[PDB]
């Protein structure tokens, strides 16, 4: 189904966007982006989870 294919293609794009950091070293500032990137991926995870779940049950 057209919609589902489009939805998955989009979720993939959301993971492609906001990818791993740099990497760059700086005291406590290196671990600062870990917090940032974890938060962002934890979010994408649940969004994708929800988006897909609507195309099933």
């Amino acid at each position, epitope marked *: 189904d057209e919609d589902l294919l489009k939805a998955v293609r989009l979720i993939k794009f959301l993971y492609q*966007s906001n990818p791993p950091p740099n990497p760059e070293g700086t005291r406590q500032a290196r671990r600062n982006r870990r917090r940032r990137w974890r938060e962002r991926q934890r979010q994408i995870h649940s969004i994708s989870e929800r988006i897909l779940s609507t195309y099933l049950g």
Partner: antibody
Amino acid sequence: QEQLVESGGRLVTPGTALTLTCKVSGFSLSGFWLNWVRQAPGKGLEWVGAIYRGSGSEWYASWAKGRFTISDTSTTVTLKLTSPTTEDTATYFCAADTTDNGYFTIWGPGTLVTVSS
Amino acid sequence: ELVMTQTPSSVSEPVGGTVTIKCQASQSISSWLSWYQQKPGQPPKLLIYDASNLASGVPSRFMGSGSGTEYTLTISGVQREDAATYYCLGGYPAASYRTAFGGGTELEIIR
């Protein structure tokens, strides 16, 4: 600092295609959701569709599909009314989702489309 | 194909008085819900996003909640300003049922 302004709202004859424009400006964020919402004279809000910015991910509503075309660009988002009818008279809005949690944080002031003979 | 069932159509209430607007979801919608106030000839303003949290600026008297398919906006100690139409927005644009609007509830302040 973010902002949205719509233009292109004008009186048109029926079937005579119009194109609406939304001037996206000040968004630190790369790609996001940009939705089109209409509101006819003294009526409720109706979501028309949306687009994910960084891609070409067009999403329309049950009624809108076909007669509508959302087009993302550098600067900026458009809405084409392929075959307008009198029932399309409304003020169209563009609204951004700066969080990607299906909610319109920033709105445009609107632009009035008028479909009449 | 997702539908929002906003109740009531209109509502009158004095200052101090409390208001309750209800939205009835036609499908799932997790925190896939937001509440908006719209004063005449003005673009809507977000009050409550992700069903229960208030946008910045929005005063404490604005309360959001929901239980699976029932969502409630609760303006507690209503003030003169709050006089406006109110909409709820449910879903995500990314289908399968897209995102849909409440359909309004006009609030008349009583003096």
